[PDB]
Design a protein around this ligand. Structure first.
Ligand SMILES: Cc1cc2nc3c(=O)[nH]c(=O)nc-3n(C[C@H](O)[C@H](O)[C@H](O)COP(=O)(O)O)c2cc1C
Ligand SMILES: Cc1cc2nc3c(=O)[nH]c(=O)nc-3n(C[C@H](O)[C@H](O)[C@H](O)COP(=O)(O)O)c2cc1C
Lengths: 135, 128
């Protein structure tokens, strides 16, 4: 009597840390960001707008994990990855990050919802060792 | 697979800021813009109640209002209006987006253009 919603389910596991991108626009730019995301990353909203989320990555980020995210996106499947991200001030944190494509009635991915979440060193070690099972 | 097997659309949605007085629109998908016939700027900063008109069931509007204050997720079938005056039945869903403390700071709203007979079914059921 009440629908399942990939978008709603995602945004509710997101504890006010999320973004929305527009896939129809060049390079999948951010078009909304929650206050939780602003305070987690350290960026202000205007700077965040119209930019691809890759700005959260830095020198130490695992390119292999970025590979998984790029690949998941091109293929239209939802996944989650744990990688090192960077705040506006240069401080780092491990990010268990989930992404889901939103499609129109004709099956075309039109928007993306990203969900970020800081995790402990311990949880991250666990998460990364699982992700590395692929290799 | 009765109320969700064919309510499958997710391109029509809006996000409102509940921390601002009249729970105004802060974002709206292009699918929404196309459905309702509005441009994004006009939509922004306004409450969504502009979709309602003379023939919209007040009792259904109530079931929404109450679900929002109480912060519970609900689906409501409504008669809505496009900017050009034309109507459509909206199987509409609201959910509160809470932070790590359980506070609602945002709301997602997903709208679904539905058929005549499906809406009659949804409406007959709502009357209980
Ligand atoms: C909605 C959405 C949210 C994203 N959030 C993050 C994120 O929080 N951290 C991150 O490192 N990458 C994130 N990404 C991935 C980057 O935006 C980008 O797709 C990725 O770095 C691979 O693309 P590239 O090789 O062009 O950099 C997100 C992508 C999308 C679509
Ligand atoms: C995120 C969100 C989306 C909404 N979308 C619609 C909609 O598409 N159609 C509609 O009739 N009401 C919609 N509403 C309901 C109105 O915005 C408002 O909550 C409702 O009219 C009850 O409040 P009121 O008694 O002041 O009118 C939405 C509300 C929220 C919070």
């Amino acid at each position: 009597e009440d629908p399942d919603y990939s978008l709603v389910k995602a945004l509710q596991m997101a504890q006010q840390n999320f973004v929305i991108t527009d896939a129809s626009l060049p390079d999948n730019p951010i078009v909304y960001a929650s206050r939780g995301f602003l305070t987690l990353t350290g960026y202000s909203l205007d700077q965040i707008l119209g930019r691809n989320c890759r700005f959260l990555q830095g020198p130490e980020t695992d390119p292999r994990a970025v590979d998984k995210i790029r690949n998941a996106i091109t293929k239209g499947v939802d996944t989650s990855v744990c990688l090192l991200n960077y705040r506006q001030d240069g401080t780092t944190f491990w990010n268990l990050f989930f992404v889901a494509g939103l499609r129109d009635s004709k099956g075309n991915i039109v928007n993306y919802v990203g969900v970020q979440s800081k995790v402990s060193e311990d949880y991250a070690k666990l998460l990364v060792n699982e992700q590395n099972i692929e290799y």
